[PDB]
Design a protein around this ligand. Structure first.
Ligand code: CFM
Ligand code: CFM
Ligand code: CLF
Ligand code: CLF
Ligand SMILES: [Ca+2]
Ligand SMILES: [Ca+2]
Lengths: 467, 522, 522, 468
């Protein structure tokens, strides 16, 4: 530990040209690190772009609006149904999440501009998908470079059709990762959607109205969270973005408390609703029994004796269930070591659920986290564990070779590398087409999934009996 | 709740009563959802001919495309060369996506870098990114060649790739003799296949253009094979296999079948196999060059004919019975090798399968889509089976291609009810499978959503999907299949007849209702 | 009525109102059918564990067997020899049935003759039938060898095949040196696999028993391979393929892959390929003999060891990862050939497929049936995949085989809820998939009737059939598949994961009901 | 040309040893032939056995009875769901046709006999399949050879359980083909089932009661026949065997006329119902429009003016429909030549349907016909066409090489031979999983099927382009 890890870091860095070496050195730390800087060229970052942050994660999930990937065909096609932000709807009729609406830029649009094309496709969207409740235009790289003004088109056509049309300047060259796309996306909700019902007073509020902020319902994750808060007597008026509707977001100014799960993507709009509407916000964690209990009790303390009593009833009901899960799976995973690399929340947030099954996270890191995320990580990780920010493919392979974790949890571009190396791998973005992993019902699925993969018979067979 | 002995994943957990009630309350309290009756009304309207007319009048909006963009193809072309790194000069989000798109289809590592051009490079150009990019990639991942393409950012700001690579070498960032072929691959022109072509022609110019006086056409006695954008490992393998059965010397130029199928044996291999730089430099000396997918290899044909002086044979993609025959006969002619008894047997075994399976295939109607060359090969083979390719859609197809296929359709009684659509997409095709319902769709995984929509109108209207194409993401390992040669023809026929028979059994499984026709023997 | 432009076959023609009415009227007026409410009551009773206990108490009645009779096996053994005519001494009805059974599975000609013993021959024996039969077959069909087996008629009346053939030779009906191997194959002993064993041992004796004096074990430096009753062409194909990759000299004894896959090229080939008489005579000179399917090659093992003195390796059927590894390592030990780089990679590629697909396979429950060796190999591969072989049925298994499989099951956490059934049939299996419902059945086409019965109880009780085995009559060309080696394991893995994923897609295809989990990527 | 076919016959026969040669010469004729004799040993007959004739074709179809293949496991298993004798029922609870019930004889049963075992499995059938309405035991070869007495087991268990148990001694060594099994099966129906309601006067007869005798409902064939007869105003009280129930068999004594389609398999019981119950029977043919019209008018003439009016209404109703079928398909098949080989009816009975599409049957023959079937064939075939009784594989391949027919229609053991030789082949037993081919709705399918196969694109692809 400590000394060995710093030896590992300097050894791995010795392959870089010095500019790369001096930068990367600042982004690898033993639990001290800088974050949210640009990626060094040619080093195979795992990062995505601002469009992924805006279209892929904040806006894409809003189910009754249509989201136009404006620009060429690639980005909307590669992002089509790649993220499992679940929803209830009749797709193509009143819900549209898994579809790919695009302006498919050809060269005439790069030359003349795509603004007249946007206006004519907004009309085509209205005739062909009448039940849509709003449109957003997600800008891909060419839109800003080319000098288009999607704002003008959105205001003019919005007015003409009495429709919410949100311009989103999330062109992939902005920022340094998916992170600025969250910020651009939060500011687009603020400026074009969130204030629509400010002078409207017909929503009958109750003292227990809440909204889940920053849960994109991967595999139903927000549904497994919502049921617990409402069993505790709260009313969730909104779900921000996973299975979200536009009226839920417009109704969010009316709630009593904003419950932030993903701090990185949604802290901007939460800060705004506290300033303008006086609504308080609090961060929580529904990964694994320990954290869910901690969170249910902290949320309940913000209300009164009845919500606090129902909180204990909920904890008591689920207690036999999560205890049966740890009794079955913890003896099977006790003392196993995990290395993680994910985006901007889950690197620190799933650690408590890993510990509930007796596992130890020996290394974690984020693609696009900022320093306040790493401050929060500090606490959750043990001393002498490895931290890496915007890890390169090379560094991640080298760190794995030296540390030899029993399980690696990261994304699809990392999966097949480590499986060929014989390390059990679980996808901690898409949940490997399994889940939910939130709440108590998700803990049960998390636990059997870590077990099925870490203890799978296929791992014992990687070397031929002759070599 | 969960029973610990029977853990439920999202399906079927959210069908539990408490969840069902919670979702109903969410909807009713806060979603301001349209009434179900209006939803049904609009769904039935989207299945009609009126809706279809409106849908076909679209000029600006594309919905559910059936193509990707240029640098995706360039990356696949680059992956086919020995120890090379695909490098896309532009912005990084693109590379993340390209990599995931192929990881999902091959269920394999897809290595590719970006040089991360940001905001300020839009004002000042991406030169420094190319310099440090190349240098860092070279030292960190140790490729023997870096193959450069471009994202639309770098295209719109007009970065001169050529000057940038030359200046990287000039400043000493990469060795002067280090292979750095390039190609401008604009995501706003053509599609992924154009990117494959542009990248291949760029690598071909790099190892050959300024060396031509040394070359004699025919001296190495080999035939060059250019695969095109290919995503079935079995297609690369069957071409090499038949050419080796013939005793024909060849060079498959861009060969990714090793990097896209490494053994899981305790170590990750970043590079494996591929066409060598030596094969690329020696490629002018071949007898001739055969392009397996000619309709998206136009730039490459112009270069191999113009510079290498090879008389590229006018051959269709080697799909189905006739075009595999014509391919074999042309290869025999060019190389003087006789077509061996093995391939003559294999041909007859395919013809034998066609005679055993023809009564179930006859007159079956299909809607299908995919890339230009794949689509016409499938159309051809369908006609050879006596099936009717009723809706033929190729989003990235062109006018001349459409003419070729319409002529192929006109030379057959089975092409009489068929229309070719170019520039049209899967929302356009969704309408066609409702208004002129086929028996099956042959397509990629996006087609699963069209099948979902047809079943919602009714089981009698469901059009089943047969997955053949790219990308297939919801089934495992079908990328190992073959669609070319007699081998691939045999696989397509088996999948088609059995899809028909599985649907017949599903329809006749009803006890005392339809099972009078549930035959043990078919 | 028919509309000339859309002719309806039996399904859906008889769903037309006038036919529905006509059939309702037939029932009501003349059939004196039990009321539907009683039919449903008895149907539900047949799904219960109470019904199951009485079902398993049967000792005299067999219902839907999963085996056939001895001469079927003998004919397939005989078809594996060069220009050999299978000849079954006994009554002709049997031969018409054996030929049709294989015709339907291979969709190929199956040539076999009878010597048509009738009633009068029961009273007097079938000697004259043997004498004229052999003579007529030789002259009309020009076999180089006639291989004789028997029907139960001939078995019960006690015809001495040896004496009858010897008398045919003495009286000049067939030439003294013309090869006429024989084997008694009573259908009331064992099953079709016993008939293959009996025929093979009879052919082996014929060519080697009297010649042993000059044979030295190892002098031809080959390994003999005895395939057993095998009905997948890919299995003969893959064994030969891997041994050639290793440079191993071998002799496949009984090889029908050419006669069961002739080209449709304008002529019918009655005979093709096959093991030559010269190879059977030279077989004692091999280094050793490997039995690919040992549990039904008992008689053969005793002859190969007792007369040819080969120490037959104790190897399981080469199915799955571990048993293909063992097979290749034993072949290497015997021949002194290294396992080549190609095969180590093929192994790693299978292991890579298992790592990709493991989350969907883990804990999936299967009911399965078939012959002893195929079944244990499938059980073994299912355990390696992390699946649970909950109901293992082998109608023609024996006590020692069951002991072996229970040992295999005991060795894995995934064998804990599995039970092996010998002597039980498919109506016994029907009850087990109702009372302890698995996720899927892996079996032959008779399994379709069990899927039909489970769907009638309700869609949530339906158990889908995954067709692997013999006979498969309701799908085309699956007999070309492979179940042995890494190749066969790869194909089975792909069929299993994809059958699971198609069932999940079906269950999540309902719009706004279950399609939240209808993922594009799985 | 007569002489050409005659020399073709001598030529082919040269290959045989004299015994075989002299016998086979008697079985090949230009139209004069003999039939229903022993198959010559070793010559690869297409014929089956007496069990195939009894279990496989007459009894197997009866849907609510359970049929036991008594003997070893082969026969029941190879015949399990091979023939497409369609029925409406809930299989395994009240209907049992596609299931295989067997006594799976082991050696202890050959040595000690299988009668106690039969008794114990009738008890097991009764516990596990309570709604069955009768049991038949179809003997396989060893039952007779070992001296068992299945009649005593059936009578004693039948009386004990008050249920019809029918012993059938259709052991495959009996006879020379499936034919004697028809006869054995017809006599077992006569002796153990048909007379059950002779003292029962409660069935309300009408003047128009009829029964379809010898239609096994292959692909629905009997349903497509029945509908026309009932549109003509007749009441079909029974369907013998295809979709047939035991009470319909027992009610056949009450009909006014028996309509015989398959004469070979059912003429025996028809003769019996006439001698014992006075019921007349007539032969008919529902293959192609010409024969269905001819038959409909012949059947109607045995009744009165209202039924004859209804006959002309039915004929006028379907006239646009079959005319549409020939307008589409006859131009596609005109002048094509067909060679057939099937069992004991369809060799002559489908010829008119081929002629309605302008095709020419240049060769036909039967596996198990008798000389009265040949007498009937004389009239249906052309001048100088080839007739073959019990053709050997060798003879049939040789005849096709010379005659070069455009289409061959025969069974599954012949299918793949001729397809490899490049001749279009249609299965004329199982209809190649298509059908019905009976009646006017069947002609539409028949026509479509001959066309899809004769004019299929694959037949032009048998020679490799470099092989010329
Ligand atoms: S990589 Fe979450 S900040 Fe964002 S897509 Fe995954 S660790 Fe994202 S928790 Fe969320 S749902 Fe995510 S898993 Fe914050 S939304 S840009 Mo990739
Ligand atoms: S071969 Fe019919 S006398 Fe009998 S099974 Fe076919 S030509 Fe039979 S018409 Fe019939 S339903 Fe038949 S087709 Fe008489 S029943 S023993 Mo093989
Ligand atoms: S960084 Fe991000 S994903 Fe890249 S483009 Fe920019 S917003 Fe989009 Fe879409 S089409 Fe293709 S993938 Fe690009 S090159 Fe032109
Ligand atoms: S001519 Fe006919 S079919 Fe033959 S036996 Fe005899 S009644 Fe039967 Fe069943 S089991 Fe097998 S196939 Fe026979 S050899 Fe003993
Ligand atoms: Ca893989
Ligand atoms: Ca065949």
């Amino acid at each position: 530990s400590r000394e060995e890890v710093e030896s590992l870091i300097q050894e791995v860095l010795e392959v870089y040209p010095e500019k790369a070496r001096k930068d990367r050195n600042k982004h690898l730390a033993v639990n001290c690190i800088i974050s949210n800087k640009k990626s060094q060229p040619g080093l195979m970052t795992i990062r995505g772009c601002a469009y992924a942050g805006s279209k892929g994660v904040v806006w894409g999930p809003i189910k009754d609006m249509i989201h136009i990937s404006h620009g060429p065909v690639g980005c909307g096609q590669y992002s089509r149904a790649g993220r499992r932000n679940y929803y209830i709807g009749t797709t193509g009729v009143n819900a549209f999440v898994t579809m790919n609406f695009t302006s498919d830029f050809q060269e005439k649009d790069i030359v003349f501009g795509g603004d007249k094309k946007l206006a004519k496709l907004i009309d085509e969207v209205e005739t062909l998908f009448p039940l849509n409740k709003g449109i957003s235009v997600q800008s891909e790289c060419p839109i800003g470079l080319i000098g288009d003004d999607i704002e003008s088109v959105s205001k003019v056509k919005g007015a003409e059709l009495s429709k919410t049309i949100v311009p989103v300047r999330c062109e992939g060259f902005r920022g340094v990762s998916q992170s600025l796309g969250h910020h651009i996306a939060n500011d687009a909700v603020r400026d074009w959607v969130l204030g629509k019902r400010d002078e409207d007073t017909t929503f009958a509020s109750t003292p227990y109205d809440v909204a889940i902020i920053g849960d994109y319902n991967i595999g139903g994750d927000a549904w497994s969270s919502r049921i617990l808060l409402e069993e505790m007597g709260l009313r969730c008026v909104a779900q921000w973005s996973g299975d979200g509707s536009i009226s839920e977001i417009e109704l969010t100014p009316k709630v009593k408390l904003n419950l932030v799960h993903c701090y990185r993507s949604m802290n901007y709009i939460s800060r705004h609703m506290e300033e303008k509407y006086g609504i308080p916000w609090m961060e929580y964690n529904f990964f694994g029994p320990t954290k869910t209990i901690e969170s249910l009790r902290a949320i309940a303390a913000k209300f009164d004796e009845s919500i606090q009593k129902k909180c204990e009833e909920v904890i008591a009901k689920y207690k036999p269930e999560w205890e049966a899960v740890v009794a079955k799976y913890r003896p099977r995973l006790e003392g196993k070591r995990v290395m993680l690399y994910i985006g901007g929340l889950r690197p620190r947030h799933v650690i408590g659920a890993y510990e509930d099954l007796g596992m130890e996270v020996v290394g974690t890191g984020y693609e696009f986290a900022h320093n306040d995320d790493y401050d929060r990580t500090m606490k959750e990780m043990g001393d002498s564990t490895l931290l890496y920010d915007d890890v390169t493919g090379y560094e991640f392979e080298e760190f794995v070779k030296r540390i030899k974790p029993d399980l690696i949890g990261s994304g699809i571009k990392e999966k097949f590398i480590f499986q060929k190396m014989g390390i059990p791998f679980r996808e901690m973005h898409s949940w490997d087409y399994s889940g939910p992993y939130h709440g108590f019902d998700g803990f049960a699925i998390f636990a059997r999934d870590m077990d099925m993969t870490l203890n799978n018979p296929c791992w014992k067979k990687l070397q031929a009996p002759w070599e | 709740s969960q029973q610990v002995d029977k853990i439920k994943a999202s399906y079927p957990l959210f069908l539990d009563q408490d969840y069902k009630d919670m979702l109903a309350k969410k909807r009713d309290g806060f979603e301001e959802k349209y009434p179900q009756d209006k939803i049904d009304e609009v769904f039935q309207w989207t299945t009609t001919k009126e809706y279809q007319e409106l849908n076909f009048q679209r000029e600006a909006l594309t919905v559910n495309p059936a193509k990707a963009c240029q640098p995706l193809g360039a990356v696949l072309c680059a992956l086919g060369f020995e120890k090379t790194m695909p490098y896309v000069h532009g912005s990084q989000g693109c590379v993340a996506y390209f990599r995931s798109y192929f990881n999902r289809h091959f269920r394999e590592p897809v290595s590719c870098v970006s040089d991360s051009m940001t905001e300020d490079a839009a004002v000042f150009g991406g030169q420094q990114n190319m310099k440090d990019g190349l240098q860092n990639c070279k030292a960190t991942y140790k490729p023997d060649m870096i193959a450069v393409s471009t994202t639309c950012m770098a295209e719109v700001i007009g970065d001169d790739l050529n000057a940038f690579i030359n200046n990287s070498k000039k400043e000493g960032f990469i060795p002067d003799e280090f292979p750095v072929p390039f190609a401008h691959t604009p995501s706003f022109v053509g599609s992924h296949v154009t990117g494959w072509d542009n990248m291949f022609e760029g690598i071909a110019r790099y190892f050959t253009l300024k060396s031509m006086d040394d070359k004699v056409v025919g001296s190495n006695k080999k035939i060059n094979i250019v695969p095109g954008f290919e995503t079935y490992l079995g297609n690369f393998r069957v071409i090499k296999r038949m050419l080796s059965e013939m005793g024909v010397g060849y060079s498959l130029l861009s060969d990714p079948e090793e990097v896209l199928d490494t053994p899981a044996d305790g170590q990750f291999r970043m590079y494996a196999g591929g066409t060598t730089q030596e094969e690329m430099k020696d490629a002018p000396n071949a007898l001739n060059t055969v392009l397996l997918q000619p309709w998206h290899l136009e730039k490459t044909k112009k270069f191999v004919e113009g510079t290498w002086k090879h008389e590229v044979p006018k051959l269709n993609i080697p799909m189905g019975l006739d075009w595999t025959d014509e391919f074999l006969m042309k290869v025999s002619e060019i190389s003087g090798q006789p077509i061996p008894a093995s391939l003559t047997k294999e041909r007859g075994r395919l013809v034998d399968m066609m005679t055993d399976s023809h009564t179930w295939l006859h007159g079956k109607r299909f809607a299908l889509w995919g890339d230009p060359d794949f689509v016409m090969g499938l159309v051809k083979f369908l006609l050879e089976l006596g099936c009717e390719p009723v809706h033929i859609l190729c989003h990235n197809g062109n006018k001349r291609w459409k003419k070729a296929v319409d002529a192929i359709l006109a030379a057959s009684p089975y092409g009489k009810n068929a229309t070719v659509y170019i520039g049209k997409d899967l929302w356009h095709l969704r309408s066609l499978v409702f208004t002129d319902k086929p028996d099956f769709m042959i397509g990629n995984s996006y087609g699963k959503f069209i099948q979902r929509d047809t079943l919602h109108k009714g089981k009698e209207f469901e059009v089943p999907l047969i997955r053949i194409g790219f990308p297939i993401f919801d089934r495992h390992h079908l990328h190992r299949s073959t669609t070319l040669g007699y081998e691939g023809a045999m696989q397509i026929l088996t999948t088609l007849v059995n899809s028909i028979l599985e649907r017949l059994d599903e329809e006749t499984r009803g006890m005392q209702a339809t099972d009078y026709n549930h035959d043990l023997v078919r």
